Motif scaffolding. Structure first.
Motif, mmCIF file in Angstrom:
data_model
loop_
_atom_site.group_PDB
_atom_site.id
_atom_site.type_symbol
_atom_site.label_atom_id
_atom_site.label_comp_id
_atom_site.label_asym_id
_atom_site.label_seq_id
_atom_site.Cartn_x
_atom_site.Cartn_y
_atom_site.Cartn_z
ATOM 1 N N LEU A 171 -10.779 -4.221 0.829
ATOM 2 C CA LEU A 171 -10.057 -3.703 2.440
ATOM 3 C C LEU A 171 -11.203 -2.636 2.886
ATOM 4 O O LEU A 171 -11.678 -1.898 1.939
ATOM 5 C CB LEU A 171 -8.650 -3.206 2.456
ATOM 6 N N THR A 172 -11.287 -2.451 3.667
ATOM 7 C CA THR A 172 -12.093 -1.184 4.303
ATOM 8 C C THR A 172 -10.799 -0.421 4.204
ATOM 9 O O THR A 172 -9.889 0.113 4.126
ATOM 10 C CB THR A 172 -12.455 -1.829 5.932
ATOM 11 N N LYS A 173 -11.188 1.020 4.717
ATOM 12 C CA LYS A 173 -10.635 2.005 4.764
ATOM 13 C C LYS A 173 -9.820 1.849 6.036
ATOM 14 O O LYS A 173 -8.631 2.780 6.098
ATOM 15 C CB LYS A 173 -11.422 3.811 4.507
ATOM 16 N N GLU A 174 -9.856 1.681 7.213
ATOM 17 C CA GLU A 174 -10.038 1.595 8.575
ATOM 18 C C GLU A 174 -8.457 0.432 8.168
ATOM 19 O O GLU A 174 -7.521 0.555 8.762
ATOM 20 C CB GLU A 174 -10.623 1.000 9.551
ATOM 21 N N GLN A 175 -8.548 -0.537 7.155
ATOM 22 C CA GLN A 175 -7.350 -1.179 6.769
ATOM 23 C C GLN A 175 -6.374 -0.148 6.361
ATOM 24 O O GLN A 175 -5.066 -1.207 6.457
ATOM 25 C CB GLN A 175 -8.033 -3.263 6.807
ATOM 26 N N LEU B 289 -2.615 -0.430 7.248
ATOM 27 C CA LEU B 289 -1.949 -0.717 6.571
ATOM 28 C C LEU B 289 -0.583 0.751 6.167
ATOM 29 O O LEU B 289 1.232 -0.302 5.907
ATOM 30 C CB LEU B 289 -2.495 -1.094 5.318
ATOM 31 N N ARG B 290 -0.694 1.848 5.500
ATOM 32 C CA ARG B 290 0.020 2.781 5.560
ATOM 33 C C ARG B 290 1.029 3.244 7.255
ATOM 34 O O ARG B 290 1.574 3.774 7.012
ATOM 35 C CB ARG B 290 -0.823 4.026 4.930
ATOM 36 N N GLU B 291 0.366 3.097 7.775
ATOM 37 C CA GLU B 291 0.813 4.129 9.294
ATOM 38 C C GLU B 291 1.474 2.897 9.602
ATOM 39 O O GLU B 291 2.087 3.140 10.194
ATOM 40 C CB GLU B 291 -0.511 4.537 10.004
ATOM 41 N N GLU B 292 1.031 1.954 9.619
ATOM 42 C CA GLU B 292 1.660 0.837 10.594
ATOM 43 C C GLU B 292 2.697 -0.323 9.764
ATOM 44 O O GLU B 292 3.977 -0.752 10.181
ATOM 45 C CB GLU B 292 0.684 -0.815 11.149
ATOM 46 N N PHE B 293 2.850 -0.441 8.643
ATOM 47 C CA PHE B 293 3.283 -1.232 7.780
ATOM 48 C C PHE B 293 4.065 -0.658 6.380
ATOM 49 O O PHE B 293 4.636 -1.169 5.825
ATOM 50 C CB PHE B 293 2.533 -2.599 7.227
ATOM 51 N N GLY B 294 3.485 0.327 6.307
ATOM 52 C CA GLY B 294 4.456 1.136 5.063
ATOM 53 C C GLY B 294 3.836 0.312 3.842
ATOM 54 O O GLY B 294 4.893 1.014 2.726
ATOM 55 N N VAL B 295 3.064 -0.408 4.150
ATOM 56 C CA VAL B 295 2.133 -0.356 2.625
ATOM 57 C C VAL B 295 1.675 0.215 1.894
ATOM 58 O O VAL B 295 -0.794 0.782 2.811
ATOM 59 C CB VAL B 295 1.407 -2.052 3.008
ATOM 60 N N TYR B 296 0.976 1.244 1.149
ATOM 61 C CA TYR B 296 0.348 2.351 0.069
ATOM 62 C C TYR B 296 -0.491 1.820 -0.419
ATOM 63 O O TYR B 296 -0.569 1.113 -1.548
ATOM 64 C CB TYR B 296 0.421 3.412 0.191
ATOM 65 N N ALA B 297 -2.096 1.857 -0.030
ATOM 66 C CA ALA B 297 -3.128 1.955 -1.486
ATOM 67 C C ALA B 297 -4.402 3.286 -1.156
ATOM 68 O O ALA B 297 -4.063 3.597 -0.273
ATOM 69 C CB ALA B 297 -3.953 0.545 -0.933
ATOM 70 N N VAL B 298 -5.521 3.449 -2.056
ATOM 71 C CA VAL B 298 -6.173 4.366 -2.063
ATOM 72 C C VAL B 298 -6.849 3.950 -0.779
ATOM 73 O O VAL B 298 -7.635 2.584 -0.824
ATOM 74 C CB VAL B 298 -6.529 4.548 -3.106
ATOM 75 N N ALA B 299 -8.366 4.914 -0.823
ATOM 76 C CA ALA B 299 -8.764 4.365 0.297
ATOM 77 C C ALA B 299 -10.108 3.151 0.066
ATOM 78 O O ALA B 299 -10.607 2.868 1.405
ATOM 79 C CB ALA B 299 -9.561 5.918 0.776
#
Lengths: 399, 400
Positions: A356-360, A364-374
Motif C-alpha cells: 500500500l502507498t502512504k496515501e492509502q 485507512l487510518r483517518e477514514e477506517f481506524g485501520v493503522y499501519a506504518v507509512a
C-alpha cells in the motif's frame, strides 16, 4: 558560565511513537492496529506464556540470591542457546569454538558485538539488507562503524531479488561484516531458500566477509530446527561467525531483555582471546546482564516437561500467524480486492509489506481506524477472525 | 586465503580479582575469610533475596499480564519513585519539571548512557573522578571517547579526606568538564564530605562551570535514606544542570536484575526535554529498552505502605550490621594487640574501607592465613561476622 545542555537540539520526533499517540487518542471502537511490533493473540493481547509463568513460579520458590552473574551471564543459558543455534552434536560445539554472552536482548547483543568489533578488529563496514530491522544502523553507527545496504526486496513484485542481492554484495570487502536475518526476515517476511543460503555461505567464504546472523524469530518460520538452517549452512562453512539472538519474541519476554551474542572462531584458543575482549566491552557498558529473563529461559529449555509446554505455545503462535496470512488473502478475494495478495502466503513471520502507498495508509487510518506504518508494513498478528472482515473491507475501499 | 578477523586479537589482561575468587573457592582451609567481595553479606555469610523483594515478586507473578516492551525510559512509576528518593517529595525541582529519568540496566548502564549522551551531544571532553574511585568509571567513560582525570581525595597514610588537596587539584578542571562525586558511602574509602564540604563543592562547581555527575549507589547505607541524599540535594539546590546515576543493586539486593536510573536535570522543563530526547537516542543505539523485572519490583515495594516499611527495616538492618562490624573490628584489633590505631574504620561508613595494609601484607594474609583481601588493601566489612572476627584480627595483627 552557560549550561552544557542549553544548546542541545531535540532529536527528531519518532513517527511511529506519534502514530501510537494518535491510535491512543482515537476513541473509535473498531480500531485495528497492524502497526505494532510484538505478537498478539486472537483477543488482541500479548500474554505471558504459561511456560514462563511456571518457570517464574519455580524461580520464586528456589532462588536464594540475586548476587551478580559473570560478565557473560548464566552458563546454562549459554549452553541451551548454543544448542538452539548449532544443533546438538554439532562439531562446532564439540570443538569448543563457540562462546556466548547473555545480553540485554538481541539489541544488547548487537551493540556489544559492534563495540567488540570496533575496538578489537579491522572491521570498518557492516552490510545490511535493504530494508532491514530499523535499529541496525543506529546501533552500528554508535560504535563508529559505517553501515552499507545490499539489494534485497523488490517492492513492486513482492520478491527477494536474489541476483540483485548477490551483485550488490560484490562491493563488500574482505573483512567487512555482512549481516543476515536467520529467519522471518524483518520486515519483508521473505527468506532465502536453503540453496540460496548455501550460495551465500560459499560466496562469503570466497570473499572473506565476517557473517553476522541476527536471529530473533527462531520457531516463527517453519519450526525450531528448520529456522536454523541458514545459520547452520553458514556455521558449517566458516571459521568465524557472530550470532545475535533474541528470546524477546519466541518466549514473549520482550521487556525482560533476554538475548545473547555468540562468537565463533577457528578454535577454542582463538575464541577465548576474542571473548575476553567482548567481556571488556560488556564491562564498559552495563557490566552484567539481567538475570530474570535468562533464568526463565534456562529453566524452560533444560526441563523436558516445561520445554514441551513452551514448544507447543510457540507452534500455536507460528500457526496462528500462518492462518491469519491465509485468512487475510482469502478474505480479500471474497471482498473483491481485484489485486493479487497471494505473496502474503508466500511469506513468513509476523511482518510483510502490504504494497500500500502512504496515501492509502493515511486514508485507512483517518477514514477506517485501520493503522499501519507509512511504508505499508503490516503485522498480521494484529488480525483476528473477528476483525478480518472489516479490515479487508477497508483495504478494498482504498484500493 | 583470508586471515581470520579474530586470529590476531590480543587477550584482555586477566582479572586479578576473579583470580582471587577462584583461588578462594579452591582453598580447603576451614579458616578462610574473603574480605575482597563486592556485595552485602549477612551474619551467616549469605546474600539473600530481601523478604520485601520476594513478596513483590509473588505479587508480580500473580498480577503481570504481559511482558510487552516498555518505552525507552522504562517504567514511569519507577521514574517518579527514583526522583523522590533523589530530591525529596515536594521538591521544587520536581514541581518545576526540571528532571527527567530513564530506567537503566544498573547504575553501570546509567553511567554508560550518560557518557554516550555527553559524548554525542555536548562539548564535554573530560570526566574528573576521585583518587581512588570506582574501578569501572574509567572504562565506561573512555569507551565513549571521554578522557578521565583524577582529583585528590583520599589521604592514605593518615586515613582521611584531604579536602584542601581536593579543592586545589580541581582548579585544573575546566568550565564544561564533568566532575563526578559519590552520593554517599564513597567507594571504596567510605569517607564522605560533610554537609558543609558538600556545600563548598556545590558553590565551587557553580563558579567554575563544571557539570556535576552524582554516582548514587548506596542510598540508605550511610545514615539513612534522606540523610544520604544531603550532598546530592546541596548540589541540586545550587545547579541548573546535573546528572545522577543511581543504583538499586545494593539497597534492594537486586544486583543481578540490573536496576538503576539516569536522571538529567536542566534549567527549565524545555531544555531538560530536548536533552532527554537525545538521551533516549543513546539508549535506542544500545540495549533499546530496560529490563522490567527489577524496576517493577522496586516500584511495587516503594508504592505500597506496608511493603515499603518491610523494605526500610531490611535496609536499616543492613546499615546497622555494617556499623556493628566496623566497631567490632576495631575493638577486636585492640583486643588482639594491634600496634596501630584503626579508629578511622569507625569514622567511615558503608561496606568498604582501605585497611592500610600493603600489597605485601595482603599477599601474606592470603597465603599464610587464608584471609583474602584485594591488592589495594580494600576490605568489605560485611565479610565480617561475630564468629570470624577474632582469627581474622589475629591474622592482621600478626602481619603488621
Amino acid at each position: 558560565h552557560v549550561g552544557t545542555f542549553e544548546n542541545i537540539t531535540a532529536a527528531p520526533a519518532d513517527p511511529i511513537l506519534g502514530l501510537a499517540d494518535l491510535f491512543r487518542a482515537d476513541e473509535r471502537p473498531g480500531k485495528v492496529d497492524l502497526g505494532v511490533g510484538v505478537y498478539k493473540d486472537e483477543t488482541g493481547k500479548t500474554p505471558v506464556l504459561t511456560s514462563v509463568k511456571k518457570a517464574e513460579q519455580y524461580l520464586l520458590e528456589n532462588e536464594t540470591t540475586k548476587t551478580y552473574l559473570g560478565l557473560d551471564g548464566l552458563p546454562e543459558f549459554g549452553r541451551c542457546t548454543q544448542e538452539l543455534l548449532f544443533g546438538k552434536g554439532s562439531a562446532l560445539i564439540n570443538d569448543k569454538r563457540a562462546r556466548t554472552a547473555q545480553t540485554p536482548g538481541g539489541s544488547g547483543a548487537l551493540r556489544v558485538g559492534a563495540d567488540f568489533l570496533a575496538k578489537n578488529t579491522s572491521v570498518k563496514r557492516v552490510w545490511v539488507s535493504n530494508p532491514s530491522w530499523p535499529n541496525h544502523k543506529a546501533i552500528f553507527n554508535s560504535a563508529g562503524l559505517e553501515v552499507r545496504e545490499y539489494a534485497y526486496y523488490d517492492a513492486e513484485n513482492h520478491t527477494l531479488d536474489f541476483d540483485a542481492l548477490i551483485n550488490s554484495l560484490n562491493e563488500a570487502q574482505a573483512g567487512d561484516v555482512v549481516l543476515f536475518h536467520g529467519c522471518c526476515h524483518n520486515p519483508t517476511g521473505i527468506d532465502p531458500t536453503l540453496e540460496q543460503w548455501q550460495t551465500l555461505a560459499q560466496l562469503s567464504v570466497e570473499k572473506g566477509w565476517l557473517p553476522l546472523i541476527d536471529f530473533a524469530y527462531q520457531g516463527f518460520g517453519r519450526g525450531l530446527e528448520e529456522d536454523a538452517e541458514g545459520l547452520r549452512a553458514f556455521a558449517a562453512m566458516h571459521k568465524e561467525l557472530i550470532v545475535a539472538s533474541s528470546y524477546s519474541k519466541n518466549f514473549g519476554l520482550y521487556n525482560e531483555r533476554v538475548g545473547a551474542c555468540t562468537l565463533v572462531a577457528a578454535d577454542s584458543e582463538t575464541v577465548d582471546r576474542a571473548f575476553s575482549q567482548m567481556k571488556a566491552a560488556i564491562r564498559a557498558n552495563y557490566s552484567n546482564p539481567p538475570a530474570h529473563g535468562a533464568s526463565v529461559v534456562a529453566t524452560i529449555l533444560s526441563n523436558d516437561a516445561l520445554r514441551a509446554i513452551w514448544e507447543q505455545e510457540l507452534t500455536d503462535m507460528r500457526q496462528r500467524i500462518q492462518r491469519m496470512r491465509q485468512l487475510f488473502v482469502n478474505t480479500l478475494q471474497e471482498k473483491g480486492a481485484n489485486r493479487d495478495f497471494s505473496f502474503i502466503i508466500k511469506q513468513n513471520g509476523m511482518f510483510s509489506f502490504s504494497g500500500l502507498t502512504k496515501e492509502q495508509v493515511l486514508r485507512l487510518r483517518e477514514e477506517f481506524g485501520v493503522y499501519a506504518v507509512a511504508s505499508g508494513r503490516i503485522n498480521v498478528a494484529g488480525m483476528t477472525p473477528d476483525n478480518m472482515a472489516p479490515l479487508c473491507e477497508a483495504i478494498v475501499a482504498v484500493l
